[PDB]
Assembly symmetry: C3
Homo-oligomer: 599 residues x 3
């Protein structure tokens, strides 16, 4: 009786108060404590050594308490710990043990989920230091680490990095480092107010599977000149991806260093997301140095249905090698994306591009094996002043990329800087269904719309179609003499080209190759013989030995004669056709022709 009151007030009290669900006689006869034990919060571990609850706040380091919670729930086979709403929970010290090597704060454990409803903040203890807030590795050496399985972080809560700048460029900072992560995810969470390297990394060098980031927000996560590099979500295990997320940056430095996503393993995706204020959209890459878990091929890579305002490149393709491993990148789709380069001065940020074929980290452009890429049904726009804007900047070797039914409205279509790298290009396909916008009309003095600054081009198709005039451009397409061109199809539709002095330019007369198939407009001067009746007209110049046929693109203002409608050539390089002199006389005309070779 005295004993009873004592028991009731003790910590075992709830385990003595009976309960039966809804007074149902067929329900289990339980105690209150059993029902309360069905859920678990940080409050259940956020206490002093005497078991008195501690209130969180800027002067309380909640880390040991949250770790105690995770450790305990782990011991029972898992569950979900709530981080309660209405409170900010500060982290103020590093974790210990296997996450120490990763500058870990909290260690995640398998089957233990975190429902983050309140706020998690970093205390100024972390100012100018490295940190990785949640770490899923159990060993300082990732290679000796066990796995993290079935760990989900979700809720309406917030992870706030406290605004602290990096102390040194060589430091790393992360939000969620899942590790060798299988069936792990982050959903609904806002990551904000920092200077970090990544917010979330999934997998470790290809180890992991079925990891996803969904409906999260990432806001202002780069803030200093010290930050070396930033990729908001790093996907480094297969069968994993990012969808329906929001990414925003406002610092100037983010415009030069920040990427929203990097996809590094096969069967990965980046979809339905919105990006603003970033340098880059996504890197899609097989790095040989990360091929341990899932092989040396990145394939089945999808970037789709995203909205972006960026300052540099939207999708960056790459692959590289080590002494013992070669990376390969193939079977990629980039579709449905609507992307623009934000308002900025020309050359004030990394060169603007929808697609970039980038060299490796050390700058090499002769190691890449990138092929079977499909770029379709995207829109891209860059303001008229941004000289450094291209549909594709093709700066390293390329083994194939196909463009169909895009709308590109920027300065260049295909570009590479001259006197830089000399890529070897195979299987570049630019279908006639790509629409070329007019924003940059009149801005292109001295410039080639397709500036083919390559070592060589093979098995490629460029079908140029203009949709408005731009008489400022030097040419629609130009190949320098140093670029070999073979087994290719290069065509310039004549619409909007009547006043262009150059349409297609082959500085090494590469269009004469045996398996080169071309057509483009040119102006040609012809002279006829004096014969009345059917009469030959011949070109005054002799540079047409490669031409298989040509046809008139000009009206005939004359009554007394007509030039040929169509022409062939002669061994000396003249064109020759048969027109008609109603009355005799030598004729001399200047005609716009469509020159054709094997087409």
């Amino acid at each position: 009786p005295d004993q009873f009151r004592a028991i009731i007030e003790s910590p075992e009290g709830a385990g003595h108060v009976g309960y039966q669900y809804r007074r149902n006689t067929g329900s289990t006869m339980r105690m209150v404590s059993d029902v309360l034990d069905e859920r678990v919060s940080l409050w259940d571990f956020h206490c002093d050594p005497s078991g008195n609850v501690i209130q969180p706040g800027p002067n309380v380091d909640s880390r040991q308490y949250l770790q105690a919670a995770i450790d305990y729930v782990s011991s029972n086979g898992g569950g979900t710990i709530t981080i309660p709403a209405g409170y900010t929970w500060y982290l103020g010290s590093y974790g210990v043990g296997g996450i120490a090597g990763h500058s870990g704060i909290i260690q995640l454990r398998s089957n233990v989920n975190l429902n983050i409803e309140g706020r998690i903040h970093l205390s100024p203890f972390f100012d100018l230091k490295p940190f990785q807030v949640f770490v899923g590795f159990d060993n300082g050496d990732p290679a000796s680490s066990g796995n993290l399985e079935n760990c989900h972080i979700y809720g309406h809560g917030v992870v706030d990095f406290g605004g602290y700048e990096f102390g040194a460029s060589s430091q790393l900072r992360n939000g969620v480092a899942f590790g060798r992560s299988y069936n792990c995810s982050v959903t609904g969470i806002t990551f904000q107010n920092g200077d970090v390297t990544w917010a979330i990394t999934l997998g470790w060098n290809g180890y992991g599977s079925n990891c996803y980031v969904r409906k999260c927000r990432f806001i202002n996560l780069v803030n200093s000149s010290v930050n070396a590099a930033h990729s908001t979500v790093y996907v480094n295990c297969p069968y994993s991806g990012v969808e329906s997320c929001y990414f925003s940056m406002s610092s100037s430095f983010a415009r030069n260093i920040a990427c929203s996503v990097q996809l590094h393993q096969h069967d990965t995706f980046y979809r339905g997301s919105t990006v603003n204020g970033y340098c880059r959209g996504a890197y899609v890459v097989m790095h040989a140095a990360e091929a341990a878990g899932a092989g040396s091929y990145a394939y089945n890579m999808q970037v789709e249905n995203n909205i972006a305002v960026i300052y540099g490149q939207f999708v960056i393709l790459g692959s590289d090698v080590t002494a013992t491993v070669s990376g390969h990148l193939n079977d990629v789709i980039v579709s449905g994306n609507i992307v623009s380069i934000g308002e900025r001065a020309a050359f004030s940020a990394p060169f603007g591009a929808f697609i970039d074929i980038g060299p490796d980290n050390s700058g090499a452009s002769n190691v890449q094996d990138i092929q079977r890429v499909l770029v379709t049904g995207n829109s891209f726009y860059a303001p008229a002043n941004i000289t450094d804007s291209a549909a594709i900047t093709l700066r390293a070797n390329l083994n194939g990329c196909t463009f169909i039914a895009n709308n590109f409205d920027c300065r260049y279509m295909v570009y590479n800087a001259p006197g830089t790298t000399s890529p070897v290009v195979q299987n570049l396909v630019w279908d006639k269904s790509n629409v070329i916008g007019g924003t940059h009309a009149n801005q292109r003095a001295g410039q080639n719309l397709f500036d083919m600054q390559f070592a060589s081009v093979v098995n490629s198709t460029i079908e140029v179609q203009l949709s408005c005039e731009d008489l400022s451009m030097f040419s629609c397409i130009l190949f320098p003499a140093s670029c070999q061109l073979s087994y290719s199809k290069i065509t310039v539709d004549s619409a909007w080209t009547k006043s262009m002095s150059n349409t297609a330019v082959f500085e090494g007369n590469q269009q004469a190759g045996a398996n080169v198939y071309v057509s483009y407009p040119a102006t040609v001067n012809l002279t006829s013989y004096n014969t009345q009746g059917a009469v030959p007209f011949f070109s005054t110049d002799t540079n047409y030995a490669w031409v298989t046929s040509a046809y008139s693109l000009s009206i005939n203002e004359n009554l007394d004669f007509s030039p040929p409608a169509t022409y062939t050539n002669k061994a000396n390089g003249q064109l020759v056709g048969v027109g008609y002199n109603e009355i005799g006389g030598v004729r001399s005309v200047s005609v716009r022709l469509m020159l054709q070779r094997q087409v």
Copy 2:
């Protein structure tokens, strides 16, 4: 001891019964009340003045109780209130204070989420009156309103509008009016059984951000002739959108007045949703009157991967101006959508269209600044009887829209009514990869497939490709004499056109323009000179002064001669070519030619 039993039975009783999670000695020593206080439901506020719980039902007005709950949780920094399953919670009176000006029932507050698992119903108090069920404004004047932040409504529950008709057309009704809403969302909820203006509105005149509607259902939300207008989700803040929702209407009135979504600010989206029984799919618009929060440009607008059966127009583009602000709409993508016009009589609902370039609310067609729109990889179908069906109805000024790789199977491709508006059109691009269906073959007597009823057309491309015969149509493309045409490309592929008497029709002979690039089939009568050997053939008519070349589309049934394969023209407007008379004689033939001008 007497005291103890008394305390235990009192409302402080649970705060005297000890608990320690799973009997863990390292866990907090708490009381039962602490653990129960981790969650909160409507039951905790749904009581009389003496604190006795009240059962909800049709004769209980739950509004003050739910408001008390929201107000209180707000006071503690937020949390989630559950609306319990297994009950219907009726609302029976208006709210008071700052939501009174919005005919508000409940006021939402920042960080207070609603987990709606049961049903929320409106009582007949609201019959024939305005209402807005949940309101996030805190002031009758939205301009003087504070913000709503971090408010999420979610669950498997239902909001039921009680079926009440509108009392008067000028009334407004809404479900969730979030207000100046930042990081607010609605997920999983069914909205049903009403006559409202909107179900959900996000933002206020551009104020707001990161607001989303996901996996909701909207069922039968228009039911009367009184309802002036309906848009189910109104997106009026940037970085916000609708995805994976279901929209259905069954009333006849919805076919004439209801739109599923309106996107009114930049960086907004409408994706992966299914629509049935609506007039319209989405309005995508910059209204100058709503440009306060986020600027006067709507850009980065995405409508993708939706399934719709509608009765009017799928996507409606617009922009307008006020005395001091001009709205602009650019950088839009419409892709992957599969849309049909439901079974209906011709002209029985608003004119059927995949894309509509609509005039402003007052009807003006000369204020719009719409450009950089990409319409790609969509399907559209309208039944054969629906005369009023078009890929695009282009009824107001247009500064650009690009169509690539769509499949359109309806009556018209491009349409505008004659004797209505006379749009000024720039940069309309209709790529040859648009496939034109055959459902309406034989229905097109008196009709032009592309009926270009415009003031002018510039920098436009129409590349017509048929995929089956339709000899009923008057022409594939017709320009009236009142339409100026310049710096454009207009082509009709010859497949399926051999028996057409008109292919392309330029009623003002606009194809003669200096920067007009055209080609289309025509039948031409020619006569030759009598000369044996190479011999000229000339057209009997003189209307070909604009033709730069022509070539045969007919076989030659003759042995003793052949007409020219190719033709040019003469100053008098004749065509002229060189054929061959094996035997002499004047020849007279009627040949199908491809007429070409600068192409």
Copy 3:
């Protein structure tokens, strides 16, 4: 007093301990039991007849307990039962009553959700037997069954089928059979480790609506040679679909029998999912035998944005009939998908295909009514050795399918086996914007790239464009003499074709048809007359009576003469053109021409 202590320890004890939320004086004065009654778990029913809790495990059959829970919550109008984390809950017996006819384990009930956080496992009682784990029918006869409404299964938990093989091929096994299911869903759940027919079926013969599978995983669900057939999610009610799911199989048998999804009713979708190790991606079909609930038309079918590695066919289209009902399939979109055939020997699995137009279950190919299908912006790849790989295998009647802006890199573009079925084909549209890959170059000896093994082809378009050479192929396109061809457009672009001896082959000279529009390259020998000056050249062969024009694709190596640039024909089937002899003499040349008919 003695009484009080007794009451407190009894099962009514919690109903005597007072509580008021957060000590708020305006809150309801409740008892602890009321707050605990807001939630419900399996623990509340998992007890013996004396009400003592039973621990789950391999030797406890949890089925009756979970059924008791569902039944009870159903009685109160619904709610959500948690299946707790940290435990495995074994099922060990069949259910009773209306689910007995479906070999049901558990009966789902309306408004009763399951939050599965722990694991549900099948005990060896089910080895070699049929089962359907969760069943939503309430009657052994589905036709006499009531509906299941508002039933959601969700959580981070697992359903594990115990690895048991099927006992006999005629057995059926399912995970979730929702029945006549309205507003039902499964979200987040992993289904693994079995040999089943389906994991989830939605609807019953068209009865149902708004059923969805989202963010689930399906892993290793076929494991034996006994299994007759497998479709992981079967969508058999309208306004329903699958999105963001993961499907994986590892058994060899799955490569031959398993499909990820089947869509069987209108307004259904399959999006954003990843598939590996399956035979097939999706069946998209109207089966007449299932047209009871939602009509005999499957329309508004969407397969989009999926990633797949399969061994057979990606999307299979079909429709069939019964004695009284005819099924129709129309208005389908397949877009944005990136698909490959996995590494395998040629012919070692069902024939590889992006699209398959399949015969019915009994093998008939003359019952299908499939039209208005759009296949756009997809990628497909098959390794070079896989002879049995096609963009489309067209094996049954087809009333229309449109391909635009795909990238297909496999052995065939269009294929049907000769000496099999003889489909009747209408409205097959293959736009020039389809890019044909080069992986299979040099592998095509004896093969036609487009092998048109049909009864007939009408109102079809094939526009062949190569992007690299493949001189191994017999032809780019071949029609056998048995295939009628009319009102069609067939073109072969000349790029990469200069060395091909056959480009287009019409074994029945079908290109001569009145409404056939063709063009393709050919080599032609010509001889001229001896006349100096304008001089005719004529073909030595007479097989060109169908040719309307031809033009040179070869250079002229000669100085003293030129052949015609362009040719027409003569009644005897010769070609004839006018060239020029600078000096007289009979000329004899062999020229590559583009032959054109009505184009």
